[PDB]
Enzyme design. Structure first.
Site, short mmCIF file in Angstrom:
data_model
loop_
_atom_site.label_atom_id
_atom_site.label_comp_id
_atom_site.label_asym_id
_atom_site.label_seq_id
_atom_site.Cartn_x
_atom_site.Cartn_y
_atom_site.Cartn_z
N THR D 31 0.67 -1.02 0.00
CA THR D 31 0.02 -0.14 0.13
C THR D 31 0.85 1.26 -0.02
O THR D 31 2.07 1.29 0.15
CB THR D 31 -0.98 0.05 1.21
OG1 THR D 31 -0.16 -0.11 2.33
CG2 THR D 31 -1.95 -1.07 1.11
N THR D 32 0.23 2.39 -0.43
CA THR D 32 1.10 3.60 -0.68
C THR D 32 1.37 4.39 0.73
O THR D 32 0.75 4.48 1.56
CB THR D 32 0.19 4.43 -1.26
OG1 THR D 32 -0.46 3.94 -2.49
CG2 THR D 32 0.91 5.81 -1.74
#
Ligand SMILES: Nc1ncnc2c1ncn2[C@@H]1O[C@H](COP(=O)(O)OP(=O)(O)OP(=O)(O)O)[C@@H](O)[C@H]1O
Ligand SMILES: [Mg+2]
Lengths: 294, 97, 232, 244, 53, 48, 242, 105, 98
Positions: D31-32
């Protein structure tokens, strides 16, 4: 790079000190070197986009110097200093060289002043060849014409013939042709017709076939007449004036064909009896042009 | 070589060079006046020229649905992510000697 | 292809480890267990398997400590190592800090244990998933353990065979059991309902249900047999 | 191609180690995670996806702290990033005992890069597959790095990794343009949130939870701490306002 | 052709989003060819249907 | 260099002294417009 | 066909394919280095290619301070760059307290080179893909440049270059030394020896350089420092001005 | 899709790449009723019940819930399908025969 | 036998003598300049074959016509050699078996 503050600030600065252009010019009467250094500080930047914009202001300032007949010396110096530094990419100075040439023409300076300025411009651009070329060849033509009136006409044959072997650029076909024909004319005067021949084989004869170059075709053949005449080959001179005849300007205008048709005829007889002379002499008879002359 | 003297490689368009392909096709199509596209295209990756001329085409399926006579930055950027997403499930990009 | 299993030390082109995913599979094939919690209790209810009807089922809740406990789903030799490891830590906490082990710190120690097998050539990532509950000083908690080693806090989850049916039960009835606090019977009853639904081609037996509970004033207690027969 | 994976120390003819490139691809599925360095601080924000709506909210973090002043957030596999931070806490702690001061950010950068490098150098371990953005504040001011699973690191004015690196690097690229000056850490809290919100259109199938952390010299006493309460709500309102 | 009969999209139960995407691809560049001429995009040359059998 | 300059005029390549070259390979990962390049030089020069 | 999936197993020509694919990993950051000798200095100038704008440029480097009198320039990849730099530093430290004096350019380069051989000797580590060039002015040898290669081969030099466009650098250097008839640059302060290295690199590559696009390390007598971008800048207009 | 060429699949040729998943819980439900509009339908049946209990059923397997319900109904010798026959329609295909195979549970 | 008795090998590794000869003979049929050094392209790479010597010169005059020049400089020669230098690992410049 990684910082975007220098791009913005200089674009701001160029706009700001172009509205102050009148204030700087008045201060130039007071101290011309005080005024000029303001503009120099801008071209110490490392952003090429903003360097193009500040050189516009330089061009405005430098007219006064050229216009005065002892301040144009500091012009010579300035050119030298701007070019060597980085050339601000290769973009900025190219624009400057182009606009300096037009200002030299409008000032109407003494012939001496006009030469020395051009001689220093070519010194800078010697080993550079990036896009200088387009400008350089136009620059050197100002020496040749001044030098015709001088006893320095032969020296002008040397400078201009070497130059175009290094310079081509992206100039138009009509300009390129015009320099090379001028050079052939200076090599008739130098007394090397053989040298002229080599320069004639550079431009193709296939390039003449369109009508935008129609005048150029006429002068070119006529130069090739003078050149084989000098070596006394009358078969070659006979063939060239026949090229001139078939060209549309000569053929249709009533007056222009006359001296041409008379000259083909005089030279064809002077030719060595070939198989070539045979086919060509009896072509001359086929024409109804010939019958007007007696 | 000697039949085949040059061996020219066409590679992927680079980060500056994908937006240069992008700029010509947005001449062609209708738009709301966009210029923040150039950055989005640039840091988005997994593309080729063909897929760039698809990013305009996929942006006009959003224009169709919403009922718009132009390509917004809503339509456009939604399209760049959709083309991008499908390329990174399959179409690995072939190996080049 | 699939020649990027055969090693747990090789990344595939896609960036998975096939070996850890294949550990996730081993779980589904073993028994189902359900976790859920409130704020006063955490409760585990587990389907126990037998192999034949002279066999007397298999225990799938291990008491970790009196304020912690876990269930297993997947391989039983893998389970034994982790429930033993987990107990070392709980005893350590009592011996060195005189302190009940916190569920969250427990889980990250378990995470570590797993990543030790993942990096190493030799060994396997553990073939079992555990649903861990405890009640510490910050009240009840419930973690979901995986072979990758990810511990995730959840109000309710299920892993194992046909666990979507229990997760469906859980979703619908998420808020109902959160709000109930103070009544131990209701959380017990709710978990019963979930695991019924998980089943397909079976019915509940008095020896399928296992109930495990911890609270505010509830010691760890493992119910089986006639103790899950009040709440059958 | 085929060959020269299946090992993690074997050179390719091109001059590379294949398996190490496949690491980066796993980090991309993660995930970012972004970090925006600021003029008297650093801000770390992370996109924490919601597995199901049964998840406890604000009780699971991919943010972990190292010593008492160094923030770390990883993208890639969640437990791998954990394992690499634990090693880091022991290393920061040995430095701290030995010299009677907290770590420099350049110090930590060296040490971490040796532990990632060690697992690319040997044949019996799989190399890491996480990036880890980290940084904090020291004597020498604020600093931000992003360490790739290849064991590569540099400083960044701003760094992004994960599924959303396509959006996030672009937003950060506008951020430097609009602020080359530095941008205060406060205004970067509100900024951190918008960046994630646009990076969540690469993981649109699921819902997310926004967690912001920070470490700032003058608004956190050099110490790392989670951004919560009123500061955290304001950033939500900021991101919500401009996304619509 | 053998004149294949229609069986409509309604007798393909569930999977509403996929049918709408597939309809964008094939049906509507033909119909709203008024829209390809307005917008000035190029036509898609095919749509892939992949998935589990 | 290879195709359009000896095509227009091979006469300047004789002065240089090399054989006029022929052959170009276009290779790259697909969708990069190697065919588009063929259709672009087919448009502009306008040969057979 | 066997014989780069193993470190130690030879080919039927007696070559180690895998070890040579490390001499071919030094193109992975695609930078060029030049280091030349003056007459009171050793200069190393290598590119600093900062590709992205998300990077802060002042942490981008390949020149590492190894010790009081020792620098090292890396060509090739960053992960192995750092491993090379710690070991050379670690050894620099060891030599001083064990043997009670500073570490020369030979002593360090020989020890790293032997170390590379050990890493190829076992099949329990790999070779690194990095080329190391050590720069110093030595205590009794003066200016010294020792290139340590990935196999563990070393040879000293008057001048060396490394990188993708190294061949273009190499002809320019050869012609200089041939014509001069000395194994040195006779410029008698380091500020002009630095200018000389910039000068040859602009001509070879055909590229201008700017403040962010160069890195310069200078070994001077008995001291060492790596130059900031604004001092590099002073040097760059010194070139342009004659 | 994993064996298709990377010059095959890419824009200019195939531009749209549309995925069809295994059908969702609601989506499954919908398929049942669409086959059941050609045959006997009872109001004992609840199609939202059946959908939930089918877990990891693709659409062709869901044709094999509804077909196999009519197989149960015929084996009875009923001239009617009941809701029960459908549950026993679920037991026909599952990719199992009602097992797991284990030496650990 | 009766058909082939001679199996005359044709190699691609060659030697420093025969690279040098093929280059001067190709450089006796086209222009040169005084700066153009041909005996420094047989040492940098070492597994070059005869067809590729016909690639290198052709490409030398393609740099030369880019500038628009009648002779072949050392700048032209080097650029054109870097195209189709070959990637072969049978080369010696990257060796340590000496
Ligand atoms: N350089 C470009 N500029 C603009 N459009 C381009 C460019 N490259 C590709 N395109 C677009 O992509 C299309 C497909 O490219 P094309 O099929 O010619 O490619 P190719 O690389 O030969 O691949 P293949 O032969 O395997 O299909 C073009 O018709 C054009 O729309
Ligand atoms: Mg094609």
């Amino acid at each position: 790079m990684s910082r975007d503050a220098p791009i913005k600030a200089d674009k701001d600065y160029s706009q700001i000190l172009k509205e102050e252009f009148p204030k700087i010019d008045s201060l130039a009467q007071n101290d011309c070197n005080s005024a000029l250094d303001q503009l120099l500080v801008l071209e110490k930047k490392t952003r090429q986009a903003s360097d193009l914009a500040s050189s516009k202001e330089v061009l405005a300032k430098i007219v006064d110097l050229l216009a005065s007949r002892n301040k144009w010396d500091d012009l010579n110096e300035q050119l030298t200093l701007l070019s060597k530094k980085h050339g601000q990419l290769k973009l900025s100075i190219q624009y400057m060289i182009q606009k300096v040439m037009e200002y030299l023409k409008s000032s109407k300076s003494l012939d001496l002043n006009t030469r020395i300025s051009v001689i220093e411009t070519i010194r800078v651009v010697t080993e550079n060849k990036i896009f200088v070329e387009v400008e350089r060849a136009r620059v050197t033509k100002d020496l040749v014409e001044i030098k015709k009136e001088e006893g320095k006409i032969d020296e002008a044959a040397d400078i201009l013939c070497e130059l175009q072997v290094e310079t081509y650029g992206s100039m138009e076909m009509s300009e390129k042709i015009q320099f090379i024909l001028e050079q052939m004319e200076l090599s008739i005067l130098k007394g090397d017709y053989s040298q002229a021949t080599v320069l004639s084989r550079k431009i193709l004869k296939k390039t003449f076939k369109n009508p935008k170059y129609e005048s150029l075709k006429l002068e070119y053949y006529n130069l090739l007449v003078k050149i084989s005449l000098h070596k006394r080959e009358y078969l070659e001179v006979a063939q060239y004036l026949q090229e001139i005849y078939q060209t549309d300007a000569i053929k249709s205008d009533e007056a222009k064909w006359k001296p041409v048709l008379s000259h083909i005829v005089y030279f064809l007889v002077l030719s060595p009896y070939g198989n070539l002379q045979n086919d060509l002499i009896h072509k001359i008879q086929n024409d109804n042009n010939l019958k007007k002359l007696e | 070589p000697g039949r085949l003297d040059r061996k020219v490689e066409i590679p992927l368009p680079n980060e500056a060079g994908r937006l240069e392909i992008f700029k010509i096709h947005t001449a062609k199509v209708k738009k709301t006046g966009e210029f923040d596209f150039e950055a989005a295209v640039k840091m988005s990756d997994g593309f080729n020229g063909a897929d760039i001329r698809n990013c305009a085409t996929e942006a006009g399926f959003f224009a169709i649905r919403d009922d718009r006579d132009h390509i917004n930055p809503d339509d456009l950027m939604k399209a760049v992510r959709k083309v991008a997403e499908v390329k990174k499930l399959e179409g690995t990009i072939e190996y080049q000697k | 292809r699939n020649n990027y299993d055969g090693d747990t030390v090789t990344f595939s082109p896609t960036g998975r480890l096939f070996q850890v995913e294949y550990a996730l599979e081993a779980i589904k094939q073993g028994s189902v267990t359900v976790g859920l919690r409130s704020n006063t209790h955490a409760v585990l209810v587990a389907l126990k398997r037998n192999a034949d009807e002279l066999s007397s089922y298999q225990k799938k809740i291990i008491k970790c400590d009196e304020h912690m406990g876990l269930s297993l789903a997947g391989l039983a030799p893998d389970a034994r190592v982790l429930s033993n490891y987990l107990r070392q830590q709980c005893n350590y906490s009592s011996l060195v800090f005189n302190r009940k082990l916190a569920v969250e710190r427990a889980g990250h120690l378990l995470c570590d244990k797993a990543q030790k097998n993942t990096q190493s050539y030799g060994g396997r990532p553990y073939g079992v998933g555990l649903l861990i509950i405890g009640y510490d000083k910050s009240g009840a908690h419930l973690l979901e353990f995986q072979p990758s080693g990810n511990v995730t806090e959840l109000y309710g989850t299920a892993i194992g065979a046909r666990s979507q049916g229990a997760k469906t039960y859980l979703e619908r009835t998420l808020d109902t059991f959160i709000k109930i606090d103070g009544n131990p019977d209701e959380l017990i009853k709710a978990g019963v309902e979930a695991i019924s639904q998980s089943l397909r081609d079976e019915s509940l037996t008095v020896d399928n249900l296992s109930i495990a509970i911890v609270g505010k004033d509830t010691p760890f207690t493992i119910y089986d047999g006639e103790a899950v027969a009040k709440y059958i | 191609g085929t060959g020269y994976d299946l090992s993690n120390s074997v050179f390719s003819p091109d001059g590379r180690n294949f398996q190490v490139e496949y690491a980066v691809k796993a980090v991309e599925n993660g995930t970012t995670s972004i970090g925006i360095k600021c003029n008297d601080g650093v801000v770390f924000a992370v996109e924490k996806l919601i597995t199901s709506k049964l998840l406890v909210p604000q009780k699971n973090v991919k943010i972990q702290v190292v010593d008492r002043h160094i923030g770390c957030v990883y993208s890639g596999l969640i437990p791998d990033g954990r394992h690499l931070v634990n090693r880091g806490r022991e290393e920061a702690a040995s430095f701290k005992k030995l010299y009677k001061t907290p770590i420099p950010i350049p110090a930590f950068a060296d040490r971490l890069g040796q532990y990632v490098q060690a697992h690319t150098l040997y044949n019996s371990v799989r190399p890491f597959g996480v990036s880890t953005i980290f940084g904090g504040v020291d004597k020498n001011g604020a600093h931000l790095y992003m360490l790739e699973p290849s064991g590569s690191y540099w400083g960044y004015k701003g760094a992004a990794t994960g599924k959303g690196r396509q959006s996030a690097k672009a937003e950060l690229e506008k951020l430097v343009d609009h602020h080359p000056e530095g941008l205060s850490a406060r205004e970067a809290v509100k900024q951190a949130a918008k960046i994630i919100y646009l990076a969540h259109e690469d993981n649109k199938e699921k819902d997310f939870e926004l967690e912001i952390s920070w470490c700032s010299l003058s608004e956190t006493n050099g110490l790392h701490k989670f951004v919560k309460g009123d500061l955290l709500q304001e950033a939500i309102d900021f991101a919500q306002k401009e996304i619509n | 052709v053998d004149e294949k009969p229609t069986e409509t999209y309604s007798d393909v139960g569930g999977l509403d989003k996929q049918i709408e995407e597939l309809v964008e691809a094939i049906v509507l560049p033909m119909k709203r060819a008024d829209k390809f001429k307005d917008m000035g995009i190029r036509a898609p040359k095919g749509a892939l249907m992949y998935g589990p059998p | 260099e290879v195709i359009e300059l000896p095509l227009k005029n091979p006469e300047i390549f004789q002065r240089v002294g090399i054989k006029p070259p022929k052959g170009v390979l276009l290779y790259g990962p697909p969708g990069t417009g190697k065919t588009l390049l063929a259709k672009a030089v087919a448009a502009t020069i306008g040969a057979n | 066909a066997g014989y780069d999936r193993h470190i130690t197993i030879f080919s039927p020509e007696g070559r180690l394919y895998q070890v040579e694919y490390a001499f071919k990993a030094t193109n992975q950051t695609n930078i060029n280095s030049l280091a030349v000798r003056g007459k009171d200095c050793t200069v190393v100038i290598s590119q600093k290619k900062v590709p992205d704008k998300l990077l802060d440029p002042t942490t981008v480097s390949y020149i590492f301070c190894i010790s009081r009198t020792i620098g090292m320039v890396v060509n090739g990849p960053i992960p192995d760059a750092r491993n090379a730099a710690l070991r050379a530093k670690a050894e620099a430290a060891e030599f001083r307290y064990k043997y009670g004096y500073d570490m020369p350019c030979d002593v360090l380069a020989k020890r790293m080179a032997n170390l590379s051989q050990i890493y190829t000797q076992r099949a329990y580590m790999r070779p690194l893909g990095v080329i190391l060039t050590f720069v110093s002015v030595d205590e009794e040898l003066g200016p010294s440049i020792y290139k340590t290669d990935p196999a563990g081969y070393y040879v000293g030099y008057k001048a060396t270059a490394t990188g993708p466009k190294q061949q273009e650098i190499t002809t320019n250097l050869e012609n200089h030394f041939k014509k001069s008839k000395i194994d040195h640059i006779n410029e008698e302060s380091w500020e002009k020896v630095v200018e000389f290295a910039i000068t040859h690199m602009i001509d070879a590559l055909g590229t201008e350089f700017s403040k962010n696009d160069l890195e310069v390390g200078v070994a001077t007598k008995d001291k060492f420092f790596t130059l900031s971008a604004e001092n590099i800048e002073e040097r760059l207009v010194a070139i342009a001005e004659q | 899709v994993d064996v298709l060429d990377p010059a095959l699949l890419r824009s200019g040729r195939l531009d749209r790449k549309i995925e069809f998943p295994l059908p969702s819980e609601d989506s499954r439900a919908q398929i049942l009723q669409i086959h059941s509009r050609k045959m006997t339908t009872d109001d004992d049946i609840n199609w939202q019940e059946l959908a939930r209990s089918t877990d990891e059923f693709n659409g062709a397997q869901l044709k094999a819930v509804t077909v196999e319900a009519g197989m149960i109904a015929l084996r009875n010798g009923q001239s009617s399908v009941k809701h029960e026959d459908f549950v026993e329609g679920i037991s026909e295909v599952q990719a199992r025969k009602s097992k797991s195979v284990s030496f650990y549970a | 036998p009766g058909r082939l008795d001679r199996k005359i090998e044709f190699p691609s590794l060659r030697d420093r003598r025969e690279r040098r000869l093929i280059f001067g003979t190709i450089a006796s049929k086209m222009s040169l300049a005084p700066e153009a050094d041909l005996d420094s392209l047989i040492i940098r790479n070492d597994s070059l074959s005869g067809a590729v010597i016909a690639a290198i010169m052709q490409e030398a005059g393609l740099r030369a016509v880019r500038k628009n020049r009648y002779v072949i400089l050392q700048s032209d020669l080097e650029e054109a050699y870097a195209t189709q230098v070959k990637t072969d690992n049978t080369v010696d410049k990257f060796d340590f078996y000496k």
